[PDB]
């Protein structure tokens, strides 16, 4: 049950390495999620075949 | 809306019945009981040139 689906893209590691002996610990890139939704709706239509006539 | 093939729309058929109707002739009175080839008869019928 849902009307609606979303659905996320991890970007790529962009960051500067650290180069020597300079301490890296706690200078931790985060990984970056995007997110996207789409949405769902009924799409109806209707004919008429005329009368008895 | 709805479809309406509505009156006199190309789309209408239309079928042509087959008997004829006919104006019948008037009925004739000097049928052949007046005409007669005999003196007693209102409408004589001279046969001296059918053949000649």
């Given at each position: 049950a849902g009307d609606r689906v979303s659905f996320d893209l991890s970007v790529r590691l962009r960051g500067q390495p650290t180069f020597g002996?300079?301490?890296?610990?706690?200078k931790e890139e985060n990984l970056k999620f995007y997110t996207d939704e789409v949405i769902i709706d009924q799409v109806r239509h209707s004919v008429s075949a005329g009368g008895r006539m | 809306s709805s479809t309406v093939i509505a009156f006199?729309?190309?789309?209408?058929q239309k079928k042509w019945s087959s008997e004829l109707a006919v104006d019948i002739r008037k009925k004739s009175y000097?049928?052949?009981?007046?005409?007669?080839?005999?003196?007693?008869?209102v409408i004589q019928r001279k046969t001296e040139v059918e053949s000649d």
């Open positions: 002996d300079d301490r890296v610990e706690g | 006199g729309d190309p789309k209408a000097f049928e052949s009981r007046f005409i007669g080839t005999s003196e007693n008869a």
